Design a protein around this ligand. Structure first.
Ligand SMILES: [Cl-]
Ligand SMILES: [Cl-]
Ligand SMILES: [Cl-]
Ligand SMILES: [Cl-]
Ligand SMILES: [Cl-]
Ligand SMILES: [Cl-]
Ligand SMILES: [Cl-]
Ligand SMILES: [Cl-]
Ligand SMILES: [Cl-]
Ligand SMILES: [Cl-]
Ligand SMILES: [Cl-]
Ligand SMILES: [Cl-]
Lengths: 226, 226, 226, 226, 226, 226
């Protein structure tokens, strides 16, 4: 049997397929699109989040009168990003200067089902008995950007287990050909919760650089041993 | 092979895994979350809807300047609920008084694929030939609450087949640590339709206590016999 | 093993299940529903997009006070449609005159996993090595209609691979019993991108009848050979 | 000089114009409309909230291809309502049975500017020096219903000063010709605040019948003496 | 005394101020803007709808970290338009080719208050006793476009009384410098209602070229005689 | 005659009423509220934006079953703010520590109509002939925060003319009793446009501290001389 998963490097290099899986293709890490203001995501654990080719506008829309428009309005695409910093000017990137910002991915064929498990603690959870580890990460749940629109990940999916934590894990691109980070680009992570605190008022916390991971749930991606 | 499913008790007791499946873990029935007003759900048939630990705030958000905030705004979580009535005062629940309201779940490993089928009638549908029954229920399609935001279930998924019908099957919780039912918490169910009525104007109906199930589609959850 | 997929005819005839799969049931092509303004879709590759019975109102909602309302507000359903033209008057369709407009579907059991692959070009992509073709099509990503609400397809799913391209692939139906096409019913397709253009400003294009497919990505639906 | 204001009876009888103003016309109390999901209100203090003629569908929409549609989709109108109770069945009202539910209004010409003032207490505020009282009421700020869409009042306007407090001050009507109250129809009132509490954590309260007004700000409508 | 009103030519020529008013300035007819997906309109009867200078991007946004961005995302402006047809290609307009599409306006000082009255019939309503006519028109209530966002007019305001009926009375412009009409650009007009029909099911109608005005309410703009 | 306007100090001191107007009352600068996710603003030029008393929760909501809830969900209020910096920790403010952050206002009675005029340049516009200056400022058009919801100002109103430019002119408060600035709190300002550039592609710009005002339109608030 064959089950297809995606791995995201969060760098300009394609990731290696995990041990016991084989590579199908490599591409660019698509997070979601926004057309006519409506966001639609592709689960990061699935082949849909790995497009063979990048574009700031990877879709087009058609109206009921048989007229289609490509990159001819104000639509968006969103992509997982690399550690590349914003330029000092903080101006949107255009053309070739976009490339260093876009995460790469690989689609891999697994011989069995692949899942994520989440600890809701700072400790990496163990795979269920009979399952083997593929990778470890941080519990990535949802995101919003323009218009507070966005999408999210299935916690059962490898897409909810991002290998590198980033406060700004994705970049916003436009039909007009620009990309940038924006002040309202938010990432939402499964949080830690202590057993004694489950029913208590959550203890509010604002975390700064160096402490961000103290409240982020950890995860492992696991494949059934057959 | 192994395929993971979730069963929800809709009570304060964890459900038993259905015959022919084995238990992986138990948890609390997460329906969806709402961050920066945007709702994101976890399919009730999948492990993502079963969190090991409850919290009124099971996530945190981070901004592009490497500052994260936990339970420090006005965000929500939503959980499948129990038969526990609202207090007479109808005041939000805090602390330990939340526990009796939260549904429990179990994640189970099945040896084969698990599906839901729906009748669009008051009769329970039969499993496809070659599939065996795991449980029966009511066709649960979507829900909305605060800001009319919400999420839904895949009808192909066991998550669309809720074992106990409830007009109010889920409770709303807040980062501030409260939970309650609200007047705008809506549940949407796959409805019945008679064959002769498929193309006709739907006959509008308002149903009261005792008659609610007369227009709710029934379902069965089925596992492929291998 | 068994994995369930859906095929949509986009005609008033049920489609035949592809070679190597067996029929489970036939129905009507449900795209999404909209209740209390919130859209919720059923992935076109899954059994949830194939309802045994059509209705302009295939759901009902319940409030927390144990009162349910069926077809008693202003809610919507959306269905894949046929080549049937709008009447000259462009008035909404009622009753039996709706039937010629609604696409049919079949749910088929496959012996192995079924995926879609997308080329991002005008050429049909090839199935991965070890996978066999079930059908070819056009990369269908998302849609919006009333209130710019909508839903979309998973690119990994057969639901993202529509066999016939249509500018207007779906019709809007109402609880009141009417259906029609509307000026704001938009379809969004995965677009073509040339390798040399990936980082460049997308070349904006408005396409008219005869040229629409020049910028639509192609796809194939593939089943793992076991 | 002449300045036009509206008074709303919240009954099936037109209100009398206040002392020192003269009647222009009488009508029906329009609160807001909702077209293509988007709400648009008419300030209750202005002539726009007083339509000469009632209809469940008082508007029509046109598309860019010179086709207009009247009462041919799923649009709404909202009207201030009377003390008429919901029928026991809680079914939507149709036809002549709608009339007892709709508030009446009168548009009056004032010789000078007319304002509202608000106390943020259970005591009626006094008119500014040089202004005379026209009526007293309760501070009505905003409302939501279908899709959590809605509109509100300007606190400087007489429209923010509703003469009779009602938990359910408005009814929802549809293009299809029905009206009803719905569980998600919310009214928002300017609340009371004690001076010592301005910076403190607000003391959360759930109020039941008999106590609702204990936290509602009071208002007066005032006309400049010339 | 002085009260400022706006008149819109719906042509490339500035309108003349009505008899008994004097010109303050001339400009371009701004309908609304859309920033971070949120629409905000300027009442067409007020000076805010008459900008001295046109731009496809007449605003800029700032974030809390003292960084402002001008025309550097995917934001919109909307302007009342002229009778200029779409080019045959239906491609967005850029640069100088935008000018023929943009309506002009004049801001005029009136010696007294200026109102609109609406008939809800195909007959022009009369001004209230003591008020004189400035112009006649059609009852323009609201509009939506991208993301079904939009804004509307106050029926008490001259802005709700558009002198020329147009199915497509406004054009959409973008920060990137393009303008076009789009399939989802909707105009909403106060409709006609017969007295005998007020409580009846509205008679649904689809109107084509030549018949559009048969269901549009008429209006007059009136100034108090002092 | 009397016309009421509001002036906002953007400091912890009440502003003085401008020359030729007299004080009615002083209060706190309310920008908008957000209930059940829906934003509703009070025009900054009007008395509604000046509340006698501050509260993080200045409203309450009621449901159709005669139950009202005050500060018992996840609702917001937004207030114009002072130059007070965020604490270093960037944690939300509670209790008395909120006071230094909240702008004060005064409501003033003018003997004639008060307007704003806007230059769309870095130069302050002149009052129309026959009008006298009350104050000068910067053209403040709209704002968004939580859920990208927000409201805006009428450009004809003094509320669109803010006396001190601030990148972060408003603070977000919650029913739970906290206030803070958030990464997605955006302010939108009327921008400058050169005459030669009106029809050209807008020249995109990202401005940093020291240069922000280079693209902000200026305004004056003017009162008719009687
Ligand atoms: Cl675009
Ligand atoms: Cl930004
Ligand atoms: Cl929170
Ligand atoms: Cl409630
Ligand atoms: Cl309905
Ligand atoms: Cl239409
Ligand atoms: Cl309608
Ligand atoms: Cl209801
Ligand atoms: Cl822009
Ligand atoms: Cl279009
Ligand atoms: Cl609250
Ligand atoms: Cl933040």
């Amino acid at each position: 049997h064959g089950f297809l998963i995606t791995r995201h490097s969060q760098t300009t290099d394609a990731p290696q397929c995990p041990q016991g899986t084989l590579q199908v293709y490599e591409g660019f890490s698509l997070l979601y699109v926004q057309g006519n203001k409506r966001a639609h995501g592709q689960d990061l654990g699935t082949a849909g989040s790995c497009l063979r080719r990048f574009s700031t506008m990877p879709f087009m829309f058609c109206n009921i009168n048989n007229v289609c428009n490509f990159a001819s309005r104000n639509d968006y695409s969103y992509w997982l990003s690399t550690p590349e910093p914003m330029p000092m000017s903080m101006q949107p990137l255009k053309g070739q200067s976009i490339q260093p910002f876009i995460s790469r991915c690989a689609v891999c064929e697994a011989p069995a089902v692949v899942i994520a498990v989440h600890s809701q603690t700072i400790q990496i959870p163990h795979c269920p008995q009979g399952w083997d580890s593929l990778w470890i990460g941080y519990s990535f749940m949802m995101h919003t950007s323009a218009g507070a629109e966005g999408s999210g990940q299935a916690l059962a999916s490898p897409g909810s287990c991002l290998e590198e934590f980033r406060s700004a894990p994705f970049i916003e691109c436009h039909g007009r050909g620009t990309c940038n980070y924006y002040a309202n680009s938010y990432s939402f992570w499964l949080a830690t919760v202590d057993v004694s605190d489950m029913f208590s008022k959550p203890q509010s916390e604002t975390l700064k650089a160096g402490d961000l991971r103290t409240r982020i749930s950890r995860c492992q991606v696991c494949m059934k041993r057959t």
